Write a protein that binds this ligand. Structure first.
Ligand SMILES: [Zn+2]
Length: 318
């Protein structure tokens, strides 16, 4: 390949060992988090943090969700999230969005735990797979978040020459009234800032992925398998001394041999080999693990009060 020199040029430009936990347990993590050294925490979260809110298993065809979409005849399943298809045929996506827009679910204990991390100046960043808006509803702000698949909170005209922004109430009204949103300036489609196939993600995603893991003191991985992009790559970016806690129902089994080898060679999770020194798995429901961890930090009541207050505020304002 005559391209190898160019690939070497870029790789050289973009190229980037203590035991800090006294014990590989939740209790050890909680003590570490109270130590001076634990200043910057990154959470990586997936669908398991929202199950307890009632968010459905979207893999199942058996719930409300997709029946309404038969009439559209998609040419392949991903077409509903592909930008060139959306531009010609926006209706299927907007029919799905009607189900997915927030309003019907509240954040979980796990979300509010991340709100406490923010309140306490510990949260460097939350990387989320989810598109349920629950992190934002819990009070994490855009600067706190890298939403891997984007967000329904913000919306923009799709034309690169315009890119007018529209607020959630403007969109939600249109979607609920089954009016396809058009830009008032240029008449192009307006879509929520969900990152479609074929679309560029916000630049800040890469910049955060390239910076944040250089000086992170603790990774909290909740409600996701380790073998999911981009998370597989991001945990292996942390400093070798940085402790990493997984809170999830189950540890995933092996999913592929390249990804598996890569993990093992690259500084993937090691909870229980003879070389284990910094990774902890806590297996159970995300809410239960965050309750437990909060109790260890002396935050039980603060967290309880926060959940109750915020849930009541959602009731009051619905
Ligand atoms: Zn426009």
């Amino acid at each position: 390949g005559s391209g190898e020199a160019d690939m070497d040029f870029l790789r050289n430009l973009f190229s980037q060992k203590e035991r800090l936990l006294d014990e590989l347990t939740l209790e050890g993590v909680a003590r570490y988090m109270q130590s001076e050294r634990c200043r910057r925490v990154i959470c990586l979260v997936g669908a398991g943090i929202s199950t307890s809110a009632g968010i459905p298993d979207f893999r199942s065809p058996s719930t409300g969700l997709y029946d309404n979409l038969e009439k559209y005849h998609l040419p392949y399943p991903e077409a509903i999230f592909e930008i060139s298809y959306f531009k010609k045929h926006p209706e299927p996506f907007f029919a799905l969005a009607k189900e997915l827009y927030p309003g019907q679910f509240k954040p979980t204990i796990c979300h509010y735990f991340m709100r406490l991390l923010k309140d306490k100046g510990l949260l460097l960043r939350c990387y989320t797979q989810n598109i349920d808006t629950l992190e934002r509803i819990a009070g994490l702000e855009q600067e706190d978040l890298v939403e891997a698949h984007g967000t329904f909170y913000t919306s923009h005209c799709v034309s690169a020459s315009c890119r007018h922004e529209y607020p959630l109430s403007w969109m939600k009204e249109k979607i609920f009234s089954e009016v396809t949103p058009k830009c008032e300036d240029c008449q192009s489609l307006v879509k929520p800032d969900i990152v479609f196939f074929g679309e560029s993600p916000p630049a800040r995603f890469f910049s955060c992925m390239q910076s944040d893991f250089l000086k992170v003191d603790l990774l909290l991985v909740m409600g996701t398998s380790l073998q999911v992009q981009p998370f597989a790559s991001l945990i292996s970016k942390a400093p070798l001394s940085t402790p990493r806690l997984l809170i999830n129902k189950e540890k995933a089994g092996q999913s592929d041999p390249f990804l598996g080898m890569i993990m093992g060679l690259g500084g993937g999770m090691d909870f229980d080999s003879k070389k284990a020194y910094r990774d902890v798995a806590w297996l159970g429901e995300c809410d239960q693990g965050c309750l437990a961890l909060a109790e260890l930090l002396g935050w039980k009541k603060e967290l309880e009060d926060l959940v109750r207050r915020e849930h009541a505020s959602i009731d009051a304002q619905s």
